[PDB]
């Protein structure tokens, strides 16, 4: 509460013990003094009737205006509801830390002096963008990533959890992370897991949502997305499917390509530009990283680049177990037979296999899923391959 800034070594040290012991001693003195003085005289009546004078000063029918500009000398230009603007005086009982252009102020009825400020709604974009606890699951579900989980933790979680490690070495944490891999490997899953396991305001936006239909709205959306990310203390901004907005940036293009490029430039500036970015961490996922902009994924912009490979032999078993955990199975399931094939199977493919097997068991009315059911579901899932056989091979 506006307490002294220790600014001692800032690492556990005897100097930091001494500065802290001193604060405790002074606080003990103040507490004893206030307690004894309250016992001697309550002063509750004195504290009251000052509020009565304040209420007298601010009449009964307080009007709601809109602060427009502070002349910085306890004066302001405030706009009434009709639209008129008045040059009034900011009285002394109004908490001036709340005043900012556009705030909803309370104005005196006769003299229009600023006599208070009203709280404002809490959804610029926060309710739309924030994900709350990720409905999917905690870190338990993710299977076989391990090293990628460790990298993500070292990027986003560790700075908030143990910052002393960074402050000791004097290095600032890595700026951002980009998750790249073939479609269906777990980028969004890991992002959601860290979102639900973290203590910071987590925001998610899909790149297709930044392709607005009106000029300048994509840039405005990115500007406001990063605007309500410093307003919410520590935050993590996860721009899923960046490939939609970021691209090689070929100059010779016409149409909405120019607007997409301008949106990308605004995002670039937000990631690293003239101003300091405060305390905000950026995660990005992209099935296709080779088509991105070198300026967009340059080191100072995105430090860490995590690769998500297709599950090979045992990660596959782990996902199968995880997705069949809450599902009764007959004692004839050859999950090893299912996974043994080198079919480039993805985790999303495994999830679809499990869901379809359960669905067809339900269709047949059975009470347990069978190995033949799993095999037929897998065959149906792998039926969605397409392409040409001889071509390319």
């Amino acid at each position: 509460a506006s307490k002294l800034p220790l600014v001692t070594p800032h690492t556990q040290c005897r100097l930091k013990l001494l500065k802290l012991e001193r604060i405790k001693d002074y606080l003990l003195m103040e507490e004893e003094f206030i307690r004894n003085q309250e016992q001697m005289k309550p002063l509750e009546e004195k504290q009251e009737e000052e509020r009565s004078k304040v209420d007298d000063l601010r009449g009964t029918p307080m009007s709601v205006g809109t602060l427009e500009e502070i002349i910085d000398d306890n004066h302001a230009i405030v706009s009434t509801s009709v639209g008129s603007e008045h040059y009034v005086s900011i009285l002394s009982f109004v908490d001036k830390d709340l005043l900012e252009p556009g705030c909803s102020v309370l104005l005196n009825h006769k003299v229009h002096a600023v006599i208070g400020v009203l709280m404002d709604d809490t959804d610029p974009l926060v309710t739309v963008m924030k994900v709350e606890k990720a409905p999917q699951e905690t870190y338990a579900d993710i299977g076989g990533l391990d090293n990628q989980i460790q990298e993500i933790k070292e990027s986003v979680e560790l700075p908030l959890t143990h910052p002393e490690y960074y402050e000791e070495m004097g290095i600032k944490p890595p700026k951002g992370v980009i998750l790249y891999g073939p479609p269906g490997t777990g980028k969004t899953l890991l992002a959601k897991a860290v979102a639900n396991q973290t203590s910071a305001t987590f925001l998610r936006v899909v790149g297709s949502e930044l392709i607005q239909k009106y000029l300048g709205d994509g840039p405005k959306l990115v500007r406001e997305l990063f605007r309500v990310a410093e307003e919410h203390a520590p935050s993590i901004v996860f721009i899923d499917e960046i490939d939609a907005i970021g691209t090689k940036r070929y100059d010779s293009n016409s149409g909405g390509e120019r607007e997409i490029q301008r949106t990308m430039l605004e995002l670039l500036n937000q990631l690293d530009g003239f101003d300091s970015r405060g305390d905000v961490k950026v995660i990005m996922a992209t099935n296709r990283i080779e088509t991105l902009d070198p300026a967009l994924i340059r080191p100072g912009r995105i430090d860490r680049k995590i690769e998500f490979p297709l599950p090979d032999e045992k990660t596959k078993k782990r996902i199968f177990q995880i997705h069949t955990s809450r599902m009764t199975l007959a004692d004839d399931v050859t999950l090893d037979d299912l996974i043994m094939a080198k079919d480039d199977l993805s985790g999303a493919d495994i999830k679809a296999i499990c869901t379809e097997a359960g669905l067809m068991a339900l269709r047949e009315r059975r009470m347990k899923v069978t190995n033949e059911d799993f095999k037929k579901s897998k065959e149906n899932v792998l039926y969605k391959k397409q392409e040409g056989t001889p071509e390319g091979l």
């Binding site: 599902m327 009764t328 068991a361 339900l362 009470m367």
Partner: protein, 101 residues
């Protein structure tokens, strides 16, 4: 419309008529279904038939109706729709032209 009748049976009738296969398999019950196709192809008739055969109320709403004048009228209508559907224990909500909203 027999193909759609069979599909909607499996999708909706099963959870309501037999809510024990899902419990003993562990697969969660669908919260609803989506119907789509050219205009006037039997969607509302099929919804009514399913509601009658599962013996539940058939509250109906349209996206165009939800698009109203008073600020917050749509939100109030949606909240009242769901609260009244909860009141009528067995219920089926049939938001008709959801594409508008």
């Amino acid at each position: 419309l027999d193909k759609q009748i069979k599909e909607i049976k499996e999708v909706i009738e099963l959870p309501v008529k037999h809510p024990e296969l899902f419990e003993a398999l562990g697969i969660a019950q669908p919260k609803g279904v989506l119907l789509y196709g050219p205009p006037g192809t039997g969607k509302t008739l099929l919804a009514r038939a399913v509601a009658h055969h599962t013996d539940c109320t058939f509250i109906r709403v349209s996206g165009s109706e939800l698009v109203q004048k008073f600020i917050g009228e749509g939100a109030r209508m949606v909240r009242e729709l769901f609260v009244m559907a909860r009141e009528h224990a067995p219920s089926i909500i049939f938001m008709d032209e959801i594409d508008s909203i």
